[PDB]
Ligand binder design. Structure first.
Ligand SMILES: [Cl-]
Ligand SMILES: [Cl-]
Ligand SMILES: [Cl-]
Length: 296
């Protein structure tokens, strides 16, 4: 499975520059031609050249949205061949904010599992909130992750793709009535209220993702999956919890039972829990635990 990481706008370009420093391709997209010159990505696309001709360096999301639509054909050609796509506009609230949803819409309408990666903190009248809402509408799964843990999505790409495929199958079948899902990785400083606005009023779920390898991998992966402030409060009171651990041939029943215990003890006593264990060679020595909390 081939992955493509697309940084949109100044923020995404800087994110992409850091992640370059494999089997993952990097694309940089921006309305600002001056900034793409500073991108280290092998694939660069300047979008909306007709639309932005004569303008200066602007911060209008609408220009970015229409810039991406003007260059739709160039974007499809660069994404062609991608199984999964990571789209992020990074720490910026300008054109990239508007272009990034369109890039995801293209990746999605091309049949690639499309993940929106949000590093910019948010919660309502900021441009950040508007962008996050727009991205949410366009992607299969939105994932919120600390800016300093950004390299994890490329470093641990194969386990992450298993987690996003799990979220995809949960949505498709409406497991435990879930119809809307946001993913979390790392020490994301948020509570359900900060994201309640932009999720469906019934069927909303939060998925924590923990990945680890080496010694005490199962314990660490399971604890990271529930260590985010967002999962710590949501897991308490959660009427339902979907728990899955996936590893390679080396995954023992001891590691699987321990991970389940850690999640069960954190969860409510009356919680309706579904436990899953999967032996998947492709993970090699990596472990990934997903914990989906619903029914708040
Ligand atoms: Cl899809
Ligand atoms: Cl930061
Ligand atoms: Cl699998």
């Amino acid at each position: 499975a081939t992955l493509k990481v697309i940084g949109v706008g100044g923020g995404g370009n800087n994110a992409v520059n850091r992640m370059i420093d494999n089997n993952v391709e990097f694309i940089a997209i921006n309305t600002d031609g001056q900034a793409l010159n500073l991108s280290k990505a092998e694939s660069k696309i300047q979008i909306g050249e007709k639309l932005t001709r004569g303008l200066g360096a602007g911060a209008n999301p609408e220009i970015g949205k229409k810039a991406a639509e003007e260059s739709r054909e160039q974007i499809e050609d660069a994404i062609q061949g991608a199984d999964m796509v990571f789209v992020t506009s990074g720490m910026g609230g300008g054109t990239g904010t508007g272009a990034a949803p369109v890039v995801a819409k293209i990746a999605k309408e091309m049949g690639a599992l499309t993940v929106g990666v949000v590093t910019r903190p948010f919660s309502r009248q900021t441009q950040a909130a508007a962008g996050v809402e727009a991205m949410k509408a366009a992607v299969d799964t939105l994932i919120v992750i600390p800016n300093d843990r950004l390299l994890d999505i490329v470093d641990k790409s194969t386990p992450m793709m298993e987690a996003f495929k799990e979220a995809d199958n949960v949505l498709r079948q409406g497991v435990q009535g879930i119809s809307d899902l946001i993913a979390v990785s790392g020490e994301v400083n948020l509570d359900f209220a900060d994201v309640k606005t932009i999720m469906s009023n019934q069927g909303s779920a939060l998925m924590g993702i923990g990945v680890s390898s080496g010694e005490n991998r199962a314990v660490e992966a399971a604890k990271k999956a529930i260590s985010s402030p967002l999962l710590e409060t949501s897991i308490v009171g959660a009427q339902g919890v979907l728990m899955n651990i996936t590893g390679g041939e080396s995954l023992s029943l001891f590691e699987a039972q321990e991970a389940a215990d850690i999640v069960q003890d954190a969860a409510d006593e009356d919680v309706n829990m579904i436990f899953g264990t999967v032996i998947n060679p492709e993970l090699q020595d990596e472990i990934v635990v997903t914990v989906i909390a619903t029914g708040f």
